[PDB]
Amino acid sequence: PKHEFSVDMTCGGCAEAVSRVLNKLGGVKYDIDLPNKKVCIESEHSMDTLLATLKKTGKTVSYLGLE
Numbered sequence: 001p002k003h004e005f006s007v008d009m010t011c012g013g014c015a016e017a018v019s020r021v022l023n024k025l026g027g028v029k030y031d032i033d034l035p036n037k038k039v040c041i042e043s044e045h046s047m048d049t050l051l052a053t054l055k056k057t058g059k060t061v062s063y064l065g066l067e
């Protein structure tokens with residue numbers, strides 16, 4: 001599935017932090033829209049796992065649904 005999340009990223013370091021947690025999880029194809037504070041993730045990970053992984057950045061995260 002393709003999941004979209006709102007992630008409260010402020011700058012390049014925030015976008016990097018998101019990338020780092022997703023890279024460590026593995027099994028994800030993602031793209032990060034820093035200006036609009038959004039992250040789209042295609043994977044067979046559960047929405048739950050993806051939410052928890054994004055939250056490891058410490059940024060506020062919410063779920064914008066399936067794409």
Ligand SMILES: [Pt+2]
Pocket residue numbers: 009010011012013014015
């Ligand atoms: Pt930042």
